[PDB]
Amino acid sequence: KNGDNWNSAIKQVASGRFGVTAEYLNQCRELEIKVAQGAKPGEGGQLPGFKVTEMIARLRHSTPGVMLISPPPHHDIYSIEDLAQLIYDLKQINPDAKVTVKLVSRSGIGTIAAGV
Amino acid sequence: CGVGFIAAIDGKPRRSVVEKGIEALKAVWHRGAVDADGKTGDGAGIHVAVPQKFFKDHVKVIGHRAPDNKLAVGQVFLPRISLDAQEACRCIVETEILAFGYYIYGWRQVPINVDIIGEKANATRPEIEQIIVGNNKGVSDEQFELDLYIIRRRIEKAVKGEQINDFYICSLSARSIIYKGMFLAEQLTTFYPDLLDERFESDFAIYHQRYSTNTFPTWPLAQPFRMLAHNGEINTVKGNVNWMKAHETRMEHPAFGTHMQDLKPVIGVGLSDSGSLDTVFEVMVRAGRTAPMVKMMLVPQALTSSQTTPDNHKALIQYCNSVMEPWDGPAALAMTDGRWVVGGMDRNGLRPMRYTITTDGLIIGGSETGMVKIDETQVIEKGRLGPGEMIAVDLQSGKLYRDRELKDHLATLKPWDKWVQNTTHLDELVKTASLKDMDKAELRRRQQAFGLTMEDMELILHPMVEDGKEAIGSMGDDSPIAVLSDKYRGLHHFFRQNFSQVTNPPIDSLRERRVMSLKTRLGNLGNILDEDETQTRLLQLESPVLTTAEFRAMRDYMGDTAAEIDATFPVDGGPEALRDALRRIRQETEDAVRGGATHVILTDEAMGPARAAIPAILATGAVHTHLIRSNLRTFTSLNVRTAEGLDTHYFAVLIGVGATTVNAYLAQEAIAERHRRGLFGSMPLEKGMANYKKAIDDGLLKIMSKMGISVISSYRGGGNFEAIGLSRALVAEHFPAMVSRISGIGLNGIQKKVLEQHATAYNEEVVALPVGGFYRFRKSGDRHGWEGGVIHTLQQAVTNDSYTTFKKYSEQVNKRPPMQLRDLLELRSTKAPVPVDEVESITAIRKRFITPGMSMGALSPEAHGTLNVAMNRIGAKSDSGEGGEDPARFRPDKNGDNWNSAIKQVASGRFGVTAEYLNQCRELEIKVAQGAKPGEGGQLPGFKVTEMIARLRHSTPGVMLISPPPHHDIYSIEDLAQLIYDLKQINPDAKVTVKLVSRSGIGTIAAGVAKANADIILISGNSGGTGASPQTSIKFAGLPWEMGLSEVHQVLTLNRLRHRVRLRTDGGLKTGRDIVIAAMLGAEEFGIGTASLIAMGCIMVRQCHSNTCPVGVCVQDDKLRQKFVGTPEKVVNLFTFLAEEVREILAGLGFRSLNEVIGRTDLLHQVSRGAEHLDDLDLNPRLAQVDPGENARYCTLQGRNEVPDTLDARIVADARPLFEEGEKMQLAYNARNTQRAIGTRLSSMVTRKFGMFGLQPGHITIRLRGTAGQSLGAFAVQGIKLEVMGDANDYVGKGLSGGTIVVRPTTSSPLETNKNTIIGNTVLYGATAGKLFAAGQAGERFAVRNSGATVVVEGCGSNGCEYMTGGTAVILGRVGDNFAAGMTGGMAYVYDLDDSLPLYINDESVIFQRIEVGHYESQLKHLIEEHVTETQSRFAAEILNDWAREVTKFWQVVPKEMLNRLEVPVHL
């Protein structure tokens, strides 16, 4: 009511697919795809046991007080063709948003850049 | 437009100064007008020192040997068309230079670039050359400059003496040089490539960029002049040039020598006002005086009778005003000598000026602050200039003198207190002389001799001596003009007063009487180029009106030195008695003057049954003009008696023509007679005489302030009038420079009428005075325009739908004898008639009609609503008026009507003006004046302000409301272009229409307004009604609208601007023939006005100013409002009938539509009255037809005229998420001075979206870096917040309604907050609600007409909180002069450290005291807490720390009207 916009303008599609939902993908302007980040490029994001509250369980559709660790590989990205298919899917489900990949700087990234 | 000066304090030549000057020139394009092509401007110029090394190297390159003494350079514009004229001009210059024996080094042709100048300013481009002269005789510099000045005068004279036009010496000296032209101000440095060389170095630079009012340019009329650079306009130019012509005969000095006989015509011919000002300035400087002294003597400071000024400056000002008469008007001067550089203001403080000091000893002054860029880490003092202030720099000693220090250094030269002590003010003289009768028969005889009536006499005389004020009319005058009458009318009916509309504003009289002077000096004229206490040995009077007692005292004083002259002529003389009488009195007074008599007394006590009296106006004019033409007026002070003077207009016109004092003895005789019969009651004779004298003085002050003049010493002999209905020969022979565009009766008719009246008076034994019918109607005589029969016939025709009755009404209206100018005309055509059906549809001409607005405070809201309903039903456009409008009227009706308007007025009061109120409309209207009162403004009596109008106007109930005459934000055409910019910014779908009043010379203002991006002009005649106005204003002002309309159309077509602006006239239209004639003259839209009122109940009772109008139209009480009998069907039928008659007459003419006739004057002809024998009124110039060329005479483009975009656009694209979702936003930008009206378009958008108060405060915030332009936050609604870091220019916070503005120096400022200026003038003009927190000294006219806003400022200027009505203002520190004058509602809190407030404040309607109630203490505490939280000012925190000790230092200012109506008692 006070002109406060609490929504998030960029949404993420990570390797966990915790809160992804048909309604969650239309409240945005740009969607982002997560491959790896600068701290844990291989093992994916993790969340401790005593952190997840009941609200976290409702957000992530899970059991309260359990250790949640995201699977390292995107189970639907096993090759670059899978990446193209996933971008097709995302652009189909959202008719007006943009897609974005997220890489980590390493040698031999040129071919990956050209592919994406 | 703008002037500016950059000076170095040390006094060393350098390049950075010229660099800064050119940079300042390059950023002023926003103020000056724009063109269509972008290659022509109004004129620009720079004035710098002479680069000695540059020309020395040039001469060395030529081949000569450069000497060591200085080298003078002179710039000349030679004619370019021919070739042999250039040769003769060079020969003239060389033969007048080589006379003094100097040596010439040669000429030079400055290279210029001729692709920048547009084609218009190129057809009159002169050939620019320079001449280099050198001193081989070896004289000092002062003699050198004096000789060069004398050489320039001699050259100008010898060239003028040969009719060699277009030859101008711009500047010839060895210290200064001038580079001026007609190019754009920006391209200066790319037009004169000489200025690009880095070898030009100076220590002072003065730049000017003017603002023209004519499409045809002229090079020599482009500022700056030799010793001056003026911004504004000088009103008193005619009186000043006349008195200069008088003084030209006895001014001499041993410095010049025989060459003084060359400089007799000190003022040339064909120069503008600033030109004459500059030439007199240069003379008085070269004579030996210094620059500050002559600045004081030409335009002095207002001699206040207060204890704010010590006696030193008081005696100085007395001497200055004793030497020379002032030059009133708005003027911000930036002049320079060879030694001093002075900036100064006028008496009132209208134009703006701001200066800044750097750390490296450099001072930069100009009109706006952001014109030059300086880092914040180098400013030392940002100042301003109040009324009459001045700041100077001395280059020889290298010092900077501010106001008080310079005033002291001036007043410490000569013993001014002793010199001023040799005067004599005639009060103790009459007091000690007081220690040392006419029968009623001859009294009535003479009263009938001079045509005085009885009822019209007491109706205007008894209210003068009863309370001390003047009468009040209630409706527009339709009496015949001075020449079309058949009864006797004195000469004063033939002179209409003047006024200023746009070029310069009028002056208020009730709240600015401190700055007006009515002093009169006798025996004071002398050598202005001499300085000795002999000049302060004269006679002083407080007012030029004298009763018989003081007149006898002065007569006994003068005694034998007077020379009394007759003013009578034999009645039995031949057909040429008046001319011989004039010649006789002329020779008599001239011989008396040559006889050493220093006084002339015009008296006509020799009237009897055998000799008639000459109208004193004519005698005074003849004597004055003859004493001027015989080089003798400088000797004798003219003294005049009369037997007719009764009203203020008579005394005004009698003093304006040359007289010094007027004594009306017969009126005092009549007053004493009326007292001896016991009519006033218990009032003594002396009290009545005092009231009468006060009334005459106030009338004179009103007539002076009508046109922006504050000194009677400069109005005398000015000829600021217009004679309508007189021959050209007589008005050019026996009167000063005036204007009479149409001719009139000559000497024969005057004598005939005088003799006939005298025969009716004395030959027959008249026993009682007639009843008279001038003001009111009577059956005896004095025919009018509206009559009983006509009113009844109109009412019947409109109430019975009988078109035949309307035809009979029109026939009755047209058959009357000629009562107006157009009645002397007759339309004709040679084509064949056409069946009536082919004429365009009735609705097509019905849509060309409007109804001029009337304020809601004047007439009852029922009639206003009826007009609006009828107009919104028929399809035409109505007007809301001046008193705002009801908000709930913004919704349609269930029956198909709408109680809204289509045109909103933005007057000089700004009552209900709000960002919303300017949105529900189509055509904004900016009222400047009207026909019933040109220079008074709208007024509303006391008891007509009920609670409804109180909640509408945000005012106090039961108290009078008189709007200020001048627009506090329109002081010149520059501010008017600015205001039109703001108004077109706030509303995207409106066309801004200006209103005008007919007068002489309106063409210049017309062309200016056309160039100022206006859309619709509106010319009004003198026959417009009102709700309340003085009688002199109604009967003795304005001209018929035909003359003005013809003039404005011809001027707009001449400059090829007519196709860019429509035209519209109003005032006294009843029939169809007048509409067709108005269409023929050039009008396109017509307003009917009061006629509609008569079709609604008004039957010309003329009691609207008493709130008891019988039928119930102009009323504000319950009982009379219920007697309303109006109906919109009446107005519908009225407009239907008008369109029907127009259709019929246009069919009879031989055309088919209105587009075929607009702009044609070759269809009119003139028929005269041979039996009247009067000199045929030469209406020929009113039929002057100029060929339009290719653009049609009526043509106009579709839609409003475009306008450039400001920063607001960049916001509305980056804030679109706000207009689509409604969320908080914070934006940041850099703000230059060129950007104007930052943040108004967003205000309009949010007003359309959420309304006035739809968003909570601070819903969207904007930060601005640098220097904001003019009109910051104009009409910002609640929810917007603006915060600027730096300084604002002017007009900041205008029209604020709910918004929030914050100004503050940036965080790195080394300055002191409460010791510098941060904003401009007229801050918060007519705001309604919101807040304004600042840190610094404001400007003059701070928070005028404020009502509801809350403002907190640290120190302000003069006229603070003037005319306030509500809200709260918290001032910290020193306040200006004349503070809280005329305040009516609200409250003020001042912080005084020296208890100086009781000396500056105005005790008219405010009381100042100490704070006692804890409630107000807590309120002020909260306000200061909020202010210091917002801007983090250190002074506010320091106050809040020591609050328990500062609660006593505060003073409270409370209006005299809210003493009991307030909830909490302000006094315990």
Ligand SMILES: Cc1cc2nc3c(=O)[nH]c(=O)nc-3n(C[C@H](O)[C@H](O)[C@H](O)COP(=O)(O)O)c2cc1C
């Ligand atoms: C009673 C009355 C009140 C008026 N009030 C205003 C006013 O408040 N502001 C204004 O600009 N003109 C005012 N006018 C002038 C009209 O707008 C219009 O110019 C004038 O009445 C037309 O002249 P007319 O009487 O011949 O029709 C008023 C006129 C009358 C008769």
Ligand code: F3S
């Ligand atoms: S004189 Fe005025 S008050 Fe009404 S009756 Fe006529 S309009």
